[PDB]
């Protein structure tokens, strides 16, 4: 009962991430205002969830096949495109970019990217690397490539509009993000908090 073995506990689940908020007209005045979400996809990036709670009890992890899932809380009469991707490089930051088309193009350039209307649902996969690398669970520290396996950027391509030509201006909620994940944690521990 005192086994000193280190074994990967591959285990599945699903978790509620966040309610996304498309920006509208008032707040959306520049390009970086079109980045609705900047959410690391490290196991321990979602405090109240189950994945993060488990992560807290291990050193490491590796998404074997993760996926972000968008569920719309709006009707179809509203129309606005969204582009979502997961940069495997936690440091690559598009916030510095000024041109909107440049940002959407460097988004669509990523391999696991998707586009969709905020009235339907899709799935944003995570493309896992090839060098068997593991990542740490604790709160992000000196460097981020040790901890984060990816960073999910959610983008606003169009302007939020409704039944009529009316352009909404109140920055209202469009849907909800869900993570359908599978990862294996290696070394039992407790991470501080």
């Amino acid at each position: 009962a005192r086994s000193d073995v280190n074994a990967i506990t591959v285990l599945n689940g699903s978790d509620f991430l966040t309610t996304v908020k498309v920006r509208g007209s008032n707040n959306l005045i520049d390009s970086k205002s079109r980045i609705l979400v900047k959410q690391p996809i490290s196991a321990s990036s979602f405090l109240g969830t189950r994945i993060s709670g488990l992560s807290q009890f291990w050193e490491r992890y590796r998404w074997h096949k993760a996926a972000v899932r968008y569920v719309p809380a709006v009707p179809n009469t509203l129309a606005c495109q969204l582009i979502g991707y997961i940069d495997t490089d936690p440091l690559d930051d598009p916030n510095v970019i000024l041109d909107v088309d440049q940002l959407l193009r460097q988004a669509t350039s990523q391999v696991g990217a998707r586009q969709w209307n905020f009235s339907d649902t899709t799935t944003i996969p995570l493309i896992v690397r090839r060098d068997d690398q593991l990542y740490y669970t604790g709160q992000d520290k000196e460097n981020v490539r040790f901890s984060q396996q990816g960073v999910f950027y959610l983008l606003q391509v169009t302007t939020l509009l409704n039944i009529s030509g009316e352009a909404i201006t109140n920055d209202l909620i469009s849907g909800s993000l869900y993570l359908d994940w599978v990862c294996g944690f290696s070394m039992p521990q407790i991470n501080p908090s």
Binding site: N76, T77, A79, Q115, N117, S119, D120
Partner: peptide
């Protein structure tokens, strides 16, 4: 039995909202 005197043809086409891609 003059065939095809005044023939007419009907063909529908659904018009849904928000055809998504």
């Amino acid at each position: 039995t003059v065939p095809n005197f005044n023939p007419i043809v009907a063909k529908p086409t659904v018009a849904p909202l928000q055809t998504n891609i």
